[PDB]
Paper text:
[name] GT6a represents a [name] clade found in more than 30 Gram-negative bacteria that is similar in sequence to the catalytic domains of mammalian [name], but has an Asn95-Ala-Asn97 (NXN) sequence substituted for the DXD motif and metal-independent catalytic activity. In previous studies we have functionally characterized one of the two [name] from [name], [name], finding that it has a similar specificity to human HBGA synthase, catalyzing the transfer of [name] from [name]-[name] to 2′-fucosyl-lactose (FAL), and similar acceptors to produce A-antigen-like products. [name] has a GT-A fold similar to structures reported for bovine α3 GT and histo-blood group A and B synthases (GTA and GTB) but is shortened at the N terminus by 45 residues or more as compared with the mammalian GTs.
A monoclinic crystal form (form III) grew in 0.1 m Bis-Tris, pH 5.5, containing 0.2 m (NH4)2SO4 and 20% PEG 3350, and diffracted to 3.50 Å. This structure includes 16 protein molecules per asymmetric unit that contain three different ligand configurations clearly shown by their electron densities. (i) Chains E, F, G, H, O, and P have intact [name]-[name] bound to a compact conformation similar to chains A and C of orthorhombic form II and designated structure A. (ii) Chains A, B, C, D, I, J, K, and L have the hydrolysis products, [name] and [name], and a more open conformation similar to chains B and D of orthorhombic form II (designated structure B); in this group, the [name] is displaced and reoriented relative to that in [name]-[name]. (iii) chains M and N have hydrolysis products and a closed structure in which the [name] remains in a similar orientation and location to that in [name]-[name] (designated structure C). The surface diagrams of the three forms show that C (chain M) is slightly more open than A (chain E), whereas B (chain A) is the most open form in which both the [name] and the [name] ligands are exposed to solvent. Structures A, C, and B are models for complexes in the hydrolysis reaction catalyzed by [name], -C, and -B, being earlier and later steps in product release. However, it should be recognized that these are structures stabilized by being incorporated in different locations in the unusual monoclinic crystal lattice.
Residue numbers in the entry: -1 to 236
Write the structure that this text describes.
């Protein structure tokens, strides 16, 4: 029985060093109720992950480094490679960036209701209480991620997205079609990683919208307490 939770994680290249503290924080804060089984789906090129030889929930998946911009553009194309084992092993899906870190215990409060659409979005830390006129949406009608001015509620970031497995997999398949449709039209959506997810969140507003506290950049001073910290990529330790 219990509730199955799946974590989508990509750390190809030099971002594999972010897995250690992320895993140690997820095992201490993220879903530690007795009704939660947590599964790690790590997409990397590293031959072995941290605590992989001890933990069985850590699924090392073959994935080379695609570089820019395919590492953020073809992100959802990677998730569909194992979409056959995702719905059978998980009930909820969650995507976190590499350099993310848990600081506060996260429970069932971020779980979308059973009646709603079952989607999850996170407000961008750079756009809090800023007007719609300052949103960096895709303003080209030729692209599939096009959002006209005046429309939209929040500016969702691509650093953190989730929801139930059934609704989240449809989200991935929808965007993948939007990427390939733009590839044929010789056009690249901007910003590809977050503009595409805002177009979907406009057509399909998420059940619950997380504050930028779950995407708090390290060093900033934002009007909320940091729950999930975006670690600085340019630190001497990294
Ligand atoms: O070589 C790379 C570059 C990026 N990422 C992933 O892409 C996400 C966003 O990275 P970002 O675009 O901020 O890095 P940049 O492309 O600016 O170097 C992160 O969660 C990384 O895990 C990756 O796996 N390998
Ligand atoms: C790198 C990051 O956190 N993402 C975005 C970046 O892509 C760009 O949209 C910028 C200005 O809108 O806001 C952030 O820095």
């Amino acid at each position: 029985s219990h509730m199955r939770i799946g974590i989508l994680y990509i750390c190809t290249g030099k971002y594999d060093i972010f897995w250690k503290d992320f895993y140690l924080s997820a095992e201490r804060y993220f879903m530690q109720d007795q009704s939660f089984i947590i599964e790690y789906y790590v997409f990397t090129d590293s031959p072995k992950l941290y605590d992989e030889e001890n933990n069985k929930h850590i699924h090392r998946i073959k994935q080379k480094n695609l570089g820019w911009p395919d590492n953020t553009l073809k992100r959802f194309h990677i998730f569909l490679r194992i979409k056959e084992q995702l719905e059978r092993e998980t009930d909820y899906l969650f995507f976190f960036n590499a350099n993310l870190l848990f600081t506060s215990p996260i429970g069932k409060e971020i779980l979308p209701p059973s009646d709603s659409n079952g989607l999850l979005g996170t407000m961008h830390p750079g756009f809090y209480n800023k007007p719609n006129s300052e949103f960096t949406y895709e303003r080209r009608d030729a692209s599939t991620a096009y959002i006209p001015e005046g429309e939209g509620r929040y500016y969702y970031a691509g650093g953190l997205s989730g929801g139930c497995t059934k609704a989240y997999l449809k989200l991935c398949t929808t965007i993948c079609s939007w990427v390939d449709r733009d590839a044929t039209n010789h056009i690249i959506p901007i910003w590809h990683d977050q503009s595409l997810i805002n177009k979907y969140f406009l057509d399909n507003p998420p059940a619950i919208t997380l504050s930028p506290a779950y995407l708090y950049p390290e060093g900033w001073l934002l009007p909320f307490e940091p729950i999930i910290l975006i670690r600085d990529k340019n630190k001497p330790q990294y």
